[PDB]
Structure 1
Amino acid sequence: DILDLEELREYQRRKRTEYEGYLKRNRLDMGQWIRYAQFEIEQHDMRRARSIFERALLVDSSFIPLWIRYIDAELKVKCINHARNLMNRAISTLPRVDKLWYKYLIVEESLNNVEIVRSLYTKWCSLEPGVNAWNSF
């Protein structure tokens, strides 16, 4: 397959033209947005990946799996702070979803950082959430 810069180049251009055709006709079909982001990571170019996710949110934000994978896409490259700000935008966009709060917790427990998880459960309780929040706190 690939030889040098120039071949890699053509191999990219072709893919991007193809996909974004297929996204051009379906704004929806989230899976497509995901896969295209995934390819974008495998090219070791993040900036584009960030965007591609963001666009994918501007279409639909209620679709959590995209939130999640746009987290893990930030973590698996071992860049955290992005995966924090993203979390503030996440739970703030959707407080009623547990999966976001729990995932942001685990992100702060595997980092051992407590001060957070204290103030964190302080919020996630302050909204009078439900039985499982208190129980887990």
Structure 2
Amino acid sequence: DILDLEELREYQRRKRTEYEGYLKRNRLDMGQWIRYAQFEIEQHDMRRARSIFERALLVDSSFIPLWIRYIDAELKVKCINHARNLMNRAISTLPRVDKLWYKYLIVEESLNNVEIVRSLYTKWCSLEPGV
């Protein structure tokens, strides 16, 4: 299969042309955006992955699992701060959904960092969310 950089290169170009064709015809079919992001991670190239998600959000922001996976895409590379900024834009974009708040929480508990989860629940309570 692959020999050197140049063969990997053509194996990328071919995929990108193909997929972004299939995204070019359907702006929808979110699973396609997901899968294509996943490929983009397996190429160990993040920057493109970040973009590809961002665009995937500008298509639809009300589909959470793309939020989530665009978190875990930042964490599984063991880079946190992006998985923070993403969370500020997330809960601020969707206060009414729970899974964002809970996930940002757990991210701050497995880091043990309390000052956050204090101030955090201070907000997430202060909005009269529910029981």
Pairwise same-fold verdict (TM > 0.5): yes
CA distance, structure 2, for counterparts of residue 10 and residue 18 of structure 1: 12
Report how far residue 54 of structure 1 moved.
0.2
Structure 1 unaligned blocks of 5 or more: 132-137
CA distance, structure 2, for counterparts of residue 5 and residue 128 of structure 1: 55
Aligned CA-pair RMSD: 0.3
Report how far residue 112 of structure 1 moved.
0.2
SS in 2 for 1:9: helix
Report how far residue 67 of structure 1 moved.
0.2
User: Where does residue 37 of structure 1 map in the other structure?
Assistant: 37
Q: Deviations over 1:47-95 (max 9, x none)?
A: 0000000000000001000000000000000000000000000000000
Q: What are the within-5 Å matches in structure 2 for residues 32-71 of structure 1?
A: 32-71=32-71
CA distance, structure 2, for counterparts of residue 127 and residue 62 of structure 1: 20
User: Where does residue 72 of structure 1 map in the other structure?
Assistant: 72
Structure 2 unaligned blocks of 5 or more: none
Report how far residue 18 of structure 1 moved.
0.1
**TM-score normalised by L of structure 2:** 1.00
Identity value in percent: 100
CA distance, structure 1, for counterparts of residue 112 and residue 5 of structure 2: 42
CA distance, structure 2, for counterparts of residue 114 and residue 5 of structure 1: 45
After TM superposition, the runs of 4+ consecutive aligned structure 1 residues lying more than 4 A away are none
CA distance, structure 1, for counterparts of residue 127 and residue 105 of structure 2: 17
**TM-score normalised by L of structure 1:** 0.95
